[PDB]
Structures are given as structure tokens and as C-alpha cells.
Structure 1
Amino acid sequence: IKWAIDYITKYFFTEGIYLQKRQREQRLLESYRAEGKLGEVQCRLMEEPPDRLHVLDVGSCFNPFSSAPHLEVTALDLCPATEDVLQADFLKVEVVPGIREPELEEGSVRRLPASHYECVIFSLLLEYMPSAEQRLQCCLQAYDLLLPEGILVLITPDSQHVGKNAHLMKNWRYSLARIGLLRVRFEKHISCMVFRKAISRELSQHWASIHREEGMCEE
């Protein structure tokens, strides 16, 4: 979808949002260090964004945006409609270092490269999950797939969710911060939510710890 490609462009290239949020996290880290906390935290920052970004789209049975000069797009789904969407169960794929391209067995993705993608897009993926645990498991997978400071983009039309609540992890910043993801954009025909792989998972954990009361209230 256009919104995600437009946000990706702003985040890495035209508005520098990756550096805005880097500053905000760095100023939060210093806040805690002036509190006597998080002294030994080491941060993981991305290099200058490459000229071709690596984008993984999960949950679309059609391939929405073809690969283009500055975008290498890999699309995956349990039930692909055509051949340019790879068949995979996102929850079963093993996310591993030491590779750079999907590893296929019998026409099915078995392994994906860890810490490789600038952006992971969930195209209704969470609406297919039978439980809140498995929705969190999708986010755990995305986290392992993302490069430092990469983004997980959730793009959900209002017509395509069930339950009057589009599953966007909006009430889940506590648990998502626990795994290293901080919310960086929410915009409302469609709902769009973006999480960022924070410069330090320990930093994000400590933010969750300070907001544990509100976190457990929302669950």
C-alpha cells in the first residue's frame, strides 16, 4: 500500500524520522542516566540507509508493490494467490543469521535472514491470528528480522478487520517495549501504526518498567 511506501520514504530518506526518534531515545536514555540508571547500556544504531531498502511484506496474498530501484520487496503469505508471493507460515519460519535471502524447501520458505530488513509490513497479518499470544509472536518474529532502528508497519483498512478493534498492538506498548519495539506513528478508511526497533532493548525495557502500572492496566 502507498501509505507504507510513503512512510518508509519519510522515515529513511526525506524527513529523517529515524534520526528524530534516535534523538528522542538518546534524550530518554540520558534522562535515565542522570537518574543513576542504565549506565552500561550499549546502543545499536543503523548505518546510513542504503540506496536499496530491504522490505518484507507479510499477509498479502497478492504482491502489492513490485520490486523497484530503491526497494527490494519480499512478499510472504500462508495462502499466496500468485507465484511472486512466497508460501510460508510466518510463525514457523526460522529467523537466522548468516544468510541474506529466503531459504526455500519444497516451494515453502523455511528460513529468513535475521537483522536484515529495514521494514517489515504486516498486511492484515494480525487479523488472521487466533490469539493475543500469537499476535505477540508475530511481533517477536518481526523484531528478529529488523535491522537496528528498522520499522514494523501495520496497515489495516477498517473494512478488513473483525471486532470493531483493528488489532494494531495499540494497547500493547508495554509488552512491545519489553521486546524492543516503541510506537513511532499512529494515523487513522484505513488505520496505520508503526513501531520502531529502539536503539537499546534494555532502554525500551526500562521505559516499560517505569510505565508498568499503565501497561498492565491495558495488558
Structure 2
Amino acid sequence: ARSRIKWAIDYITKYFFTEGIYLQKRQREQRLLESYRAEGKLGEVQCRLMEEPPDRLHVLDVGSCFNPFSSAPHLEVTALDLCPATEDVLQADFLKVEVVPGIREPELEEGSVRRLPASHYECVIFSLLLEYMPSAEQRLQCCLQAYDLLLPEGILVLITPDLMKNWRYSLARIGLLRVRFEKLPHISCMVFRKAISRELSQHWASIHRCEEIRI
């Protein structure tokens, strides 16, 4: 049985470096936009693309007990947790974090992370986190902040314990298109991409229809 931590490091390496899945998904999303445009249902939209990935990806791991991903090569990880188990993990309630443009590092007040940089992370990781959230409204809030935190074409890694088609509609409704789904032992591993255009992903969701993340 393979680890979710290895599965995620493997995809992030394929998506940005070894296989360039960020470029394959870009070419597709551009094709869907041309198609929608030619059916008259979308038209002009804003498109933002990612530059060549850096040699060190900025990864945000929210709900990290330990820092599983810190040692991975080419991953500069910022680890946040409500009840950290290791000292390298920052204390934070993600639900109470502001996504601030114009900054780069977490800003802490009274030991807790209160502010994170917007459009800064090539990857945000929610490994077995959303299930703790009290309501479905707060699960979608976590995903919405992640979207604000991701760079264009960045990826949100979502690992849930043992509706996905709703999680796919609900996330495309906010600008996140799924790019991978695999069933590992006792867990479902997903990746959602920050599409080149939110309007495009939102349109895909409209055609493919609950607007929250339930359990």
C-alpha cells in the first residue's frame, strides 16, 4: 500500500517538472474556451498563465501535523496547523487567515498565523483536513482561500478519507478544475488546478451540474 505523502510528491513533480501537466492542461483549457466562445456562451474572458515553474516550488501544507513534505526536493514548504505536533509547523486556524496581496511570508500575531501571501504558492495541500471542518460552508471557505493563495495554474492537492462529482462542480464553480483522481487504500486523492480563467471553469461547472463541499 502506497502513501498519500509519496503520491502527492510524485504528482507535483510530474505536474511542474517531469511531465509538464501544467502545459497539457493549459492547451486543453484554451481549447474549451475556444469551443465555448464559438457557441456564443462565454466570449471575452481574462486569462492568466504560469511562467516556467521555479526550481523550488512554494508549497503550502494546511493541516500538517508534522512537516511530511519539507524534506521533499524542490519543495519550499510552509506548514500550518491548528494543533502542531512538530516545532517546524506553524500554529494557525486556517479559517481565520487573511489572504493579503503584496506580502510574501506568513504574518503572525500572538503566535498564530493571521495573514498569508496571495497568488504566491504553486501548490496548496489539504491532506485530510476538510473533514475536520464544522460545516460544509467552512470547507468551501478553505478551498476559496486556497484559490486566492495559488498562483495561476497552481494546483490544490485534496486528500479525503473514505459527492466527488459535487466536489468537482462546487470547486469548478469557484475556478478550480480537477486534473487527477486516484483511489488509494482508505483515501481518495484529488488535484484541482487553478484554471487559466475563472469564468471558463465556472462555465464548465454550469454545463456540468449543491454549491458547497459536503461530507
TM-score normalized by the length of structure 2: 0.90
Given that 1:4 and 1:155 are in contact with CA atoms closer than 8 Å, whether structure 2 keeps it comes out as no
Aligned: 1:16 with 2:9:
no
Given the alignment, which residue of 189, 210, 213 partners 2:207?
210
Aligned-residue offset at 1:170: 4.4
Note closer, same or farther for the CA distance 1:210–1:13 as it changes in structure 2 (3 Å cut): same
1:170 and 1:195 mapped to 2: Cα distance? 13
Note closer, same or farther for the CA distance 1:75–1:218 as it changes in structure 2 (3 Å cut): closer
1:85-143 deviations in Å (ceiling 9; x for gaps): 00000011001111001001121101000000000011211111111111111110110
Note closer, same or farther for the CA distance 1:218–1:103 as it changes in structure 2 (3 Å cut): closer
SS of residue matched to 1:18: helix
1:156-196 deviations in Å (ceiling 9; x for gaps): 455xxxxxxxxx85422222111100111000043211101
Aligned-residue offset at 1:67: 4.5
Given that 1:115 and 1:147 are in contact with CA atoms closer than 8 Å, whether structure 2 keeps it comes out as yes
Identity over the aligned pairs, expressed in percent?
100
Aligned-residue offset at 1:38: 2.3
1:4-35 deviations in Å (ceiling 9; x for gaps): 11100000011111011111111100101111
Aligned: 1:176 with 2:171:
yes
SS of residue matched to 1:171: helix
Q: Which moved more, 1:62-71 or 1:115-124?
A: 62-71
Aligned-residue offset at 1:68: 5.4
Give the count of matched residue pairs.
206
2:53 and 2:77 mapped to 1: Cα distance? 16
Note closer, same or farther for the CA distance 1:218–1:71 as it changes in structure 2 (3 Å cut): closer
2:131 and 2:161 mapped to 1: Cα distance? 11
Query: What corresponds to 2:84 in structure 1?
Result: 80
TM-score normalized by the length of structure 1: 0.88
Query: What corresponds to 2:141 in structure 1?
Result: 137
Note closer, same or farther for the CA distance 1:169–1:133 as it changes in structure 2 (3 Å cut): farther
Given that 1:117 and 1:145 are in contact with CA atoms closer than 8 Å, whether structure 2 keeps it comes out as yes
Note closer, same or farther for the CA distance 1:55–1:177 as it changes in structure 2 (3 Å cut): same
Aligned-residue offset at 1:208: 1.6
Query: What corresponds to 1:112 in structure 2?
Result: 116
Given that 2:175 and 2:195 are in contact with CA atoms closer than 8 Å, whether structure 1 keeps it comes out as yes
